[PDB]
Ligand binder design. Structure first.
Ligand SMILES: *[C@@H]1O[C@H](CO)[C@@H](O[C@@H]2O[C@H](CO)[C@@H](O)[C@H](O)[C@H]2NC(C)=O)[C@H](O)[C@H]1NC(C)=O
Ligand SMILES: *[C@@H]1O[C@H](CO)[C@@H](O[C@@H]2O[C@H](CO)[C@@H](O)[C@H](O)[C@H]2NC(C)=O)[C@H](O)[C@H]1NC(C)=O
Ligand SMILES: *[C@@H]1O[C@H](CO)[C@@H](O[C@@H]2O[C@H](CO)[C@@H](O)[C@H](O)[C@H]2NC(C)=O)[C@H](O)[C@H]1NC(C)=O
Ligand SMILES: *[C@@H]1O[C@H](CO)[C@@H](O[C@@H]2O[C@H](CO)[C@@H](O)[C@H](O)[C@H]2NC(C)=O)[C@H](O)[C@H]1NC(C)=O
Ligand SMILES: *[C@@H]1O[C@H](CO)[C@@H](O[C@@H]2O[C@H](CO)[C@@H](O)[C@H](O)[C@H]2NC(C)=O)[C@H](O)[C@H]1NC(C)=O
Ligand SMILES: *[C@@H]1O[C@H](CO)[C@@H](O[C@@H]2O[C@H](CO)[C@@H](O)[C@H](O)[C@H]2NC(C)=O)[C@H](O)[C@H]1NC(C)=O
Ligand SMILES: *[C@@H]1O[C@H](CO)[C@@H](O)[C@H](O)[C@H]1NC(C)=O
Ligand SMILES: *[C@@H]1O[C@H](CO)[C@@H](O)[C@H](O)[C@H]1NC(C)=O
Ligand SMILES: *[C@@H]1O[C@H](CO)[C@@H](O)[C@H](O)[C@H]1NC(C)=O
Ligand SMILES: *[C@@H]1O[C@H](CO)[C@@H](O)[C@H](O)[C@H]1NC(C)=O
Ligand SMILES: *[C@@H]1O[C@H](CO)[C@@H](O)[C@H](O)[C@H]1NC(C)=O
Ligand SMILES: *[C@@H]1O[C@H](CO)[C@@H](O)[C@H](O)[C@H]1NC(C)=O
Lengths: 50, 420, 88, 198
């Protein structure tokens, strides 16, 4: 599962069988790391107009 | 069921009967208008392609479509500040109230700003604010004026209205006692000023009561501010739709640009990308068109709001239903999220009695007409009185004027006129 | 600021009429040695009205003012041929 | 910059039209934006493919243009309706609408023409020197409460006068200036003075 972004530790709980989560827009919100079974949140990299 | 259009009312019309109010009430009503909407902005390239180089290059085949869409949205966002500025920023100075709130019994403490809060809003304004209530190239620009700044303009308009009447809206603010200001407003609706002074306590009490009713109405009924909530909901829905469209395949193997890119070589990847571009571009164009139409609707509302501020708050209107129902006396603005709320104070006749009337009285062959008011009778004696409030007076030569004689006016009454 | 990161303008804590708007209460202008500055905009001068229960102000003179209001009425009556534009 | 509103209308239509023209140069996936390059080089079974994609692109560009002009046209019409209203209420009469015909009290207006628009010159009256006077809602004389028919009662610190509201012009208070209703015990803040009877 790929993408570009900033990873932080999450403070949410996944059920034991869930592998990743999604937001209201149905995009990837968070993932379960495959080696350490911890949940990380994915934040888009900052951007804006100039 | 078949709906009713209202109760029936047979008016007791006759060629010699007039009904005249002997009492009145003061009513304060609330009118709510949208002024602006969220200044959103959408990046025409990021929405469609993200950070994909291949997609970005394919979009060059469409020329200026990308920039036209951003230009249109930018224009809307600018207009939203223009609308706000026109409605509220129309006072030349920021006026303040005196430290001693002596307004002749009229209590404005619920509409004046509260000095103890971090945001100087009135009690009513706090109620209004409490009741009204994805990253793919989509952003929101802040408004130029902040809520605190709007509150200051509102406060200035209110302070002006209370201490200098409408004068500040034409020239310099010139102080006037509040009760005298009301006297002018009463003459302005056809009611002689002595009516105000002789009933000053009553009028002030009815006013104060009406404000308390407003606080309860707004506190208990969330739906009261539905017009502003509606603007918010429609823009939110349009935007969520734009986002959901990114998940459509439009004939593609996948809606995800990265799934196409990570699996196919360019000679094939481009086919899949091109169809996603067409679909996403069409979806974005649809969004922008709808926002232009919606923006126009809001602007029209803002223009109306600006007009009401000028004609209802900065003066006394003669337009019949323009500044609330009843005869207009004065109005006070309050701010609201993305809009303005007006409190309109009107005079309503409220107890009528059946009097006999006549168009004229003939005395010694001369036809006498009232200068002001009408002639009435209680069944024994004839009096002259002002039209909007029963107050009978002896008919004298200082009340009437003479033109013509007993043989011209239809329905002329045989009586005398007193000469002091 | 709340409107973004502003680089190159000098922020001051004075208050001035808005010239170039930035957002969220902030505007910028070029002034006195002349450079771009950023500031909170003023909403106007303050005026404490001398209100009392027995005092009235009355003008003893007046002026005549003539102002200009400009409104659009129409636009160019263009026309586009739906076939020629596309196919020549 | 005084006439920027009219210049703005011109600039927006010019920009929209130039955009429509520039779009003719886009390929939209075609080998060439020039219809004649396609026709002079390819046999019909192939030329049609290239032509069809140019048509789709050009047709979409034209539809976009027309939609924008319909929206813009509506904005102008609304302005024209306002202008027509002002001609009727500011030029052909004297308006009572507070900020409708300029700031200050309206006296009269005069139209002037302009490219694609109208310019109004609004003549208004503005009060311009105030002074601080003492006032009262009424004067009681021999138990009778007297109110002005027009104007207000004022005092210069020693004498009371009645004057018109919008221009100081003090007059002796007489029975021809005031009317009587009620007495000294009803009006709040009523002043103790006399009224002259000619
Ligand atoms: C104006 O009305 C407000 C209520 O809307 C009055 O507020 C009360 O003030 C007293 C103190 O004098 C408090 O004990 C009450 O609890 C307050 N009432 C509420 C609902 O908070 C205010 O006194 C009135 N002002 C004048 C001059 O009459
Ligand atoms: C005009 O109507 C008002 C009410 O709108 C009358 O005032 C009320 O009188 C009753 C007694 O009959 C009191 O209990 C209420 O408290 C009064 N209300 C207020 C706000 O003061 C008034 O008396 C009527 N006047 C005439 C001449 O009929
Ligand atoms: C109206 O008032 C007049 C007196 O001002 C009454 O007196 C006269 O009546 C006779 C008979 O009808 C007329 O010919 C005279 O012309 C009247 N005098 C004048 C000055 O008009 C008259 O009767 C009264 N009319 C009614 C209907 O009561
Ligand atoms: C019409 O109004 C008059 C007063 O203007 C009433 O007459 C008065 O009645 C009182 C007793 O209630 C007497 O003390 C006064 O002297 C009478 N005045 C006059 C001029 O006669 C008259 O009764 C009323 N008529 C009707 C039908 O209401
Ligand atoms: C207002 O003017 C009256 C005279 O018109 C003064 O004269 C009387 O004063 C006594 C004592 O206060 C009262 O009981 C009388 O009722 C007054 N006469 C009348 C006709 O009202 C009165 O003193 C003056 N009041 C003030 C405050 O100067
Ligand atoms: C208030 O106005 C009166 C005039 O209406 C001023 O009194 C006059 O003063 C002149 C001298 O400047 C005398 O010649 C007149 O005879 C006075 N008239 C009267 C009726 O006394 C009065 O001084 C003004 N008061 C103030 C405080 O300015
Ligand atoms: C993967 O291997 C590392 C290193 O031996 C170990 O620390 C980790 O717990 C292992 N994770 C899983 C899911 O087996
Ligand atoms: C006037 O009289 C009619 C009967 O002729 C009655 O129905 C009506 O209610 C009366 N109106 C008032 C104000 O008393
Ligand atoms: C009013 O109507 C009655 C109906 O019976 C009629 O007799 C009377 O002459 C009329 N009066 C006037 C002034 O029209
Ligand atoms: C801010 O205000 C202080 C006075 O309170 C003044 O000394 C200082 O120079 C001002 N600074 C700026 C950047 O305007
Ligand atoms: C009225 O008096 C106040 C002081 O109480 C003063 O500040 C104000 O400028 C005066 N107004 C006029 C018109 O002289
Ligand atoms: C006006 O206010 C003063 C405040 O000291 C008070 O003494 C006086 O009685 C008030 N007069 C009126 C008519 O309200």
């Amino acid at each position: 599962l790929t993408g570009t972004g900033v990873l932080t530790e999450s403070n949410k709980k996944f059920l034991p069988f869930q592998q990743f989560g999604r937001d209201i827009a149905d995009t990837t919100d968070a993932v379960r790391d495959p080696q350490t079974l911890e949940i990380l949140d994915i934040t888009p990299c900052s951007f804006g107009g100039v | 069921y078949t709906m009713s259009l209202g109760a029936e009312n047979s008016v007791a019309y006759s060629n010699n009967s007039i009904a005249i109010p002997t009492n009145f009430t003061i009513s304060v009503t609330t009118e709510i208008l949208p002024v602006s909407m969220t200044k959103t902005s959408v990046d025409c390239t990021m929405y469609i392609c993200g950070d994909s180089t291949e997609c970005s290059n394919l979009l060059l085949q469409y020329g200026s479509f990308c920039t036209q869409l951003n230009r249109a949205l930018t224009g809307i966002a600018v207009e939203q500040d223009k609308n706000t500025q026109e409605v509220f920023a129309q006072v030349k100075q920021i006026y303040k109230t005196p430290p001693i709130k002596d307004f002749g019994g009229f209590n404005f403490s619920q509409i004046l700003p509260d000095p103890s809060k971090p945001s100087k809003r009135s009690f009513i304004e706090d109620l209004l604010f409490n009741k009204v209530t994805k990253f793919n190239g989509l952003t929101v620009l802040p408004p130029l004026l902040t809520d605190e700044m709007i509150a200051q303009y509102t406060s200035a308009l209110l302070a002006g209205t209370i201490t200098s009447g409408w004068t500040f809206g034409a020239g310099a603010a010139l102080q006037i006692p509040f009760a005298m200001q009301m006297a002018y407003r009463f003459n302005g609706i056809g009611v002689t000023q002595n009516v105000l002074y002789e009933n000053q306590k009553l009028i002030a009490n009815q006013f104060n009561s009406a404000i308390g009713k407003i606080q309860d109405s707004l506190s208990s009924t969330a739906s009261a501010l539905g017009k502003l909530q509606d603007v918010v909901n429609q823009n939110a829905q349009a935007l969520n739709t734009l986002v959901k469209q990114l998940s459509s395949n439009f004939g593609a193997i996948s809606s995800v640009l990265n799934d196409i890119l990570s699996r196919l070589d360019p000679p094939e990847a481009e086919v899949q990308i091109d169809r996603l571009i067409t679909g996403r571009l069409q979806s974005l164009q649809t969004y922008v068109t709808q926002q232009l139409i919606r923006a126009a609707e809001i602007r029209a509302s803002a223009n109306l709001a600006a007009t009401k501020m000028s004609e209802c708050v900065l003066g006394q209107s003669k337009r019949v239903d323009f500044c609330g129902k009843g005869y207009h006396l004065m109005s006070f603005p309050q701010s609201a999220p993305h809009g303005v709320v007006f409190l309109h104070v009107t005079y309503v006749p409220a107890q009528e009695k059946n009097f006999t009337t006549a168009p004229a009285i003939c005395h010694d062959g001369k036809a006498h007409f009232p200068r002001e008011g009408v002639f009435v009778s209680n069944g024994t004696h004839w009096f002259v009185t002002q039209r909007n409030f029963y107050e009978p007076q002896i008919i004298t030569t200082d009340n009437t004027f003479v033109s013509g004689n007993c043989d011209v006016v239809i329905g002329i009454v045989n009586n005398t006129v007193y000469d002091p | 600021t709340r409107a973004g990161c502003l680089i190159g303008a000098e922020h001051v804590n004075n208050s001035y009429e808005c010239d170039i708007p930035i957002g969220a209460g902030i505007c910028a202008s070029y002034q006195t040695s002349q450079s771009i500055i950023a500031y909170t905009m003023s909403l106007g001068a303050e005026n404490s009205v001398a209100y009392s229960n027995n005092s009235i102000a009355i003008p003893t003179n007046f002026t005549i003012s003539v102002t200009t209001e400009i409104l659009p009425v129409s636009m160019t009556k263009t026309s586009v041929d739906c076939t020629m534009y596309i196919c020549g």
